[PDB]
Amino acid sequence: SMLTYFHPDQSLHHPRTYFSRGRMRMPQEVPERAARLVAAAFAMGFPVREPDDFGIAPIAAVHDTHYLRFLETVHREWKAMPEDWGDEAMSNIFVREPNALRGVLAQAARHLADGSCPVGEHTWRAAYWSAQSALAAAAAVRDGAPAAYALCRPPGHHARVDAAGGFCYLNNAAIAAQALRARHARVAVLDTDMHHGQGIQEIFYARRDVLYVSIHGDPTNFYPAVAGFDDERGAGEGLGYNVNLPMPHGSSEAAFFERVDDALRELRRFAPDALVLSLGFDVYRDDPQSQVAVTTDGFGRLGHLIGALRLPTVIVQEGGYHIESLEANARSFFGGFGA
Amino acid sequence: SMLTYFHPDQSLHHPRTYFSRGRMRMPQEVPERAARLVAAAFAMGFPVREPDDFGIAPIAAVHDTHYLRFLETVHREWKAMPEDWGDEAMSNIFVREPNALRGVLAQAARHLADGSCPVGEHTWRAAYWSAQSALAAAAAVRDGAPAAYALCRPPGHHARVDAAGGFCYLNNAAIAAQALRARHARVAVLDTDMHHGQGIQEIFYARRDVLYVSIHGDPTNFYPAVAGFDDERGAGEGLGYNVNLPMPHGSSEAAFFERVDDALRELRRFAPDALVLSLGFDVYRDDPQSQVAVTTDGFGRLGHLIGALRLPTVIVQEGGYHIESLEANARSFFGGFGALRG
Ligand SMILES: [K+]
Ligand SMILES: [K+]
Ligand SMILES: [Zn+2]
Ligand SMILES: [Zn+2]
C-alpha cells in the first residue's frame, strides 16, 4: 500500500480536436483512463485521496510564468474571438521566434508546440489539479513515505518550460522532482513511457542536480519526432546528465529490459537520493501507440526492478491509452513494486 | 501594353487540406484565380507569355538549399508513410529548433511554418514555374522594359528563407528584387497585399540595398500573427529600411489610402532605381480575408498612384480570393496604373 492522489476536477478535461500526421483525429487521452486506474488502486487496497492545494509557486518553480498566465486565460481569450474559431484553443502558426506575442493567436503560436494540446474550458483547471496530485505525492515522500502514486491526468512529460504538447500542459514529473530537491541534493527522473519526455529533458538540460533517463521508441517519424535521439547528452554542467535510450520500432520485450538495465547502470553511478518514475502503460503490446512488445507480466518485472532500488519514489502517471488493459497492467506493475 | 508572364504548370497545384483557427478549412488559393487573371490580362491587350527556364540558381540566391530539396522531395517521402498520413505533407509538430531533422516528420516541423502550406503532388512544380514567371518579368524590366507583370500563382510573400507558409512556397517578389539588383543599385519592394509579407521582411531585414514597405491588416489575431508590427524596422545596416504600415481591423478605404500616402513618402526618400510591387486583391471589401473596405475603383486609385512614380516596375501577383471580382479589380488596377505613364 501507498498513498494515491487524484482530484475529481482532473476528469473535467475532455477536448475533441486533435491534429496529427495529416488529419484530425479521435481523442485518446480521455477521462476513462483515470476511471480504470482508480479501479486498480481500489483493488489493491491503496487509499485514494484528494491532494491539498499547494498553490501556483511550485508549478512556477519549473514553468515560465508567462506560459502559466497564457494557459490560465487562453480559453477565455479564444472564446472572445469569432464563433467560427471554435471552442478549443489550438495553434495553426508554428513560430516560436521571431514572435511579438501580441494577441491570443500569437500566444498560441509560442505556447502550444504541436497539434495535440488543445485547450478547452476545463483544461487549465484539470491540468492544475493533476500537478497538485504530483505535488501531494512529492510532499508525502519528501516527509518520509517511501513511495506515493500521483494519478496524473492530463499527463505531463511532453510539457516544456513554456509550451504545452502531446496531451501535456504541465510537467507533473518535473514539478515533483523540483519539490523533492528541497530535501534531497540528487534526484533522478526515469521515464519508461513509450514516448520520449522531451519536456522533462528540456527543463533539466543544463543541470546535474536532476538526472534524466528515458527509454522510448525511436523518434524517427514517431512522437516527439524532433528529440529523443541518443546523442542528446545535455549542455553546460548538465553534460553527461541526460540519457536517451531509444529502441527500434517493433522491439521485443527483451530489448526493453536491456534498456532498463542501461537505465539502472546510469542510476547506480549517479547515486540519487530520491526517484521520480514517469510511468506509461503505452509500451503494452496492444496499445495502438506501442512500438515494443511489453506484456502484462513485463510490467510486474519492471515494478520489481524499480522497487528493489529502495529509493524514496514518486510514481507519476503518464500515457497508456488501451482502456481494457489499464487495470491489469497497473496491478501487475504495483504488485512487482511491492514484492 | 505590358508583358505578362504565366506558365500553365502553375495551374497544377490544388491541395485539399488547410488547417487554421481551430479547424480544417476550404481551400481558397485555387487554380481558377490564375484563369481569371489571365483572361483579365488578355482583355486588356497584354501579351501573355510563358517564362523561359531561368534555372534553380536565382531561387537558391534567396532560399536555403535544404529547404529547396525538401520542397522537391517531401511529397514523395510523405507518400512512403502510412496511408493514414494522407496525400499532402503538413506539419503537426511545431518545432524548428532544436530539431535533429531525422525523418520526414521532423523535416516538416522545420520547413512548414503553418497549417496553410500543404505540399501535394504538383506543389513543387507549380511553385518552381511561378517563380520563373517572376524571374521572366524581372529580366524584361532589367533589360529595358518599363513594366512587366509576373502572374505568379502560387503566391510568394509569406515564404521565408527556410520555410513555406500562408499558401506560399517560394518568395517570388524577393526572388525578383534580388535579380533586379544585377543592374540596379537600389531596389524597393512595396507590398500592398492584405497580409504582412513576413517572408520578404526576413529575407532583407539586415539589408539597406532593398527597401521593404508593407501595408496590411493589424497582425493581432490576423495572419501572419507573429510579425508585421510597426517597431520591426530592420537590423544592422538595414535599420530604418524595413517599414510596416499596419491598419486597424475594419478600416475605411480612406485609411488604406492614407497608408499608401505614407508608403510613397518612404519610396521617395529612398529613391529606388527599380520597384517590385507585391499586389494582392484581398484588400477588396468583399474578399473573405479582408480587413479593409477597398472598392473596385480603389484598385484603380492604387495603380494610378503607383504608376505615377514612373519607375521601372515588376508587378508580382500575391493573394486575392474573391473569384467573381478578380477580373474587374485587376482591370481597374492596370487601367489606373498606365494613366500617368509613357
Ligand atoms: K520515455
Ligand atoms: K502587405
Ligand atoms: Zn506515451
Ligand atoms: Zn493576402
Any idea which ligand is nearest the CA of B278?
2
C-beta atoms of A109 and B222 within 8 A: no
According to DSSP, the residues that pair with B10 across neighbouring strands are none
Describe the strand order of the beta sheet including A274-279 as a list of residue ranges: A48-49, A3-5, A147-150, A313-317, A274-279, A187-191, A210-217, A242-247
Q: Which three cell numbers stand for residue B26?
A: 476550404
Which CATH number is B81's domain given? 3.40.800.20
- Ligand 2 center from residue B277 Cα (angstroms): 10
Residue B116 φ/ψ, nearest 5 degrees:
-110, 20
Burial class of residue B82, CB neighbours in 10 A (0-12, 13-18, 19+): exposed
CA angle B281, B286, B291 (to 5 degrees): 75
> Is A158 annotated in the active site?
yes
Query: Please, are residues B297 and B332 in contact by the beta-carbon 8 Å criterion?
Result: yes
Q: Count CA atoms within 13 Å of residue B214 on its CB side.
A: 34
Coil, strand, or helix at residue B278? Answer: strand
CA–CA distances in Å: residue B252 to residues A318, B249, B257, B303: 52, 9, 9, 18
For A226, the closest of B23, B109, B223 (CB atoms) is B109
For strands B187-191 and B210-217, give the pairing.
parallel
User: Binding site: residue ranges of A?
Assistant: 193, 195, 282
- The CA distance from B223 to B221, in Å, is 7
Q: Which three cell numbers stand for residue A164?
A: 504545452
For testing contact with chain A, the best of B17, B221, B230, B232 (most A CBs within 10 A): B221
Which residue is associated with the grid cell 497545384? B13
Q: Count CA atoms within 13 Å of residue B300 on its CB side.
A: 10
For B225, the closest of A109, A220, A232 (CB atoms) is A109
* Amino acid, res. A177: A
Query: Please, are residues B253 and B295 in contact by the beta-carbon 8 Å criterion?
Result: yes
Q: Is residue B98 reached through a cis peptide bond, with omega within 30 degrees of 0 on the bond before it?
A: yes
- The CA distance from A307 to A296, in Å, is 17
Q: How far A97 CA sits from the closest chain B CA (Å)?
A: 8
Query: Please, are residues A12 and A134 in contact by the beta-carbon 8 Å criterion?
Result: no
Count CB atoms within 10 A of the CB of residue A233: 13
- What resolution does the deposited structure have, in angstroms? 2.2
Minimal CA–CA distance to B189: which of B60, B198, B281? Answer: B198
Minimal CA–CA distance to A337: which of A304, A291, A301? Answer: A304
Q: What is the largest CA-CA distance in chain A?
A: 57
- Alpha helices (H) along chain A: 32-43, 57-60, 65-79, 104-111, 123-142, 172-180, 198-203, 253-270, 296-307, 326-337
Coil, strand, or helix at residue A116? Answer: coil
- The CA distance from A109 to A7, in Å, is 30
Any idea which ligand is nearest the CA of B218?
2
Length of chain B as a residue count: 342
Q: Which three cell numbers stand for residue B259?
A: 497608408
CA angle A309, A313, A314 (to 5 degrees): 150
Q: How far B218 CA sits from the closest chain A CA (Å)?
A: 10
Q: Where are the extended beta strands (E) located within B82-138?
A: none
Minimal CA–CA distance to B48: which of B150, B139, B171, B120? Answer: B150
> Which of B13, B63, B75, B158 is labelled catalytic?
B158
Minimal CA–CA distance to A211: which of A145, A248, A265? Answer: A265
Q: Which three cell numbers stand for residue A275?
A: 526517484
Count CB atoms within 10 A of the CB of residue A304: 15
Q: Which three cell numbers stand for residue B252?
A: 475605411
Method of structure determination: X-ray
CA–CA distances in Å: residue B290 to residues A74, B27, B194, B228, B321: 25, 16, 7, 16, 10
Burial class of residue B185, CB neighbours in 10 A (0-12, 13-18, 19+): exposed
Minimal CA–CA distance to B292: which of B338, B256, B238? Answer: B256
- The CA distance from A160 to A167, in Å, is 12
| Total of domains in chain A | 1
Q: Report CA torsion sign: B173, B175, B178, B183.
A: negative
Minimal CA–CA distance to A193: which of A131, A276, A137? Answer: A276
User: Binding site for Zn(2+): residue ranges of B?
Assistant: 193, 195, 282
Measure the CA dihedral B128/B68/B243/B214, to 10°: 30
DSSP A164-210: BBTTBSS-HHHHHHHHHTTT-S-EEEEE-SSS--HHHHHHTTT-SSE
- Ligand 3 center from residue A287 Cα (angstroms): 10
For A92, the closest of B88, B109, B114 (CB atoms) is B114
C-beta atoms of B221 and A93 within 8 A: no
Size of interface A-B (CB pairs under 8 A): 152
Q: Is residue B118 reached through a cis peptide bond, with omega within 30 degrees of 0 on the bond before it?
A: no
Length of chain A as a residue count: 339
> Which of A13, A111, A157, A158 is labelled catalytic?
A158
Count CB atoms within 10 A of the CB of residue A271: 10
Minimal CA–CA distance to B199: which of B227, B176, B236? Answer: B227
Domain range for B146 is 1-342
CA A109 to chain centre: 22
How does B34-56 read in b/e, with b if 16+ C-beta sit within 10 Å? bebbbebbeebebeebebeebee
For strands A48-49 and A23-25, give the pairing.
unpaired
Which residue is associated with the grid cell 528584387? B177
- The CA distance from A318 to A157, in Å, is 7
Contacts of A216 in chain B (CB under 8 A): none
C-beta atoms of B221 and A105 within 8 A: yes
Minimal CA–CA distance to A6: which of A190, A148, A157, A147? Answer: A148
Q: Where are the extended beta strands (E) located within chain B?
A: 3-5, 18-20, 23-25, 48-49, 147-150, 187-191, 210-217, 242-247, 274-279, 313-317
- The CA distance from A229 to A216, in Å, is 10
- The CA distance from A205 to A216, in Å, is 18
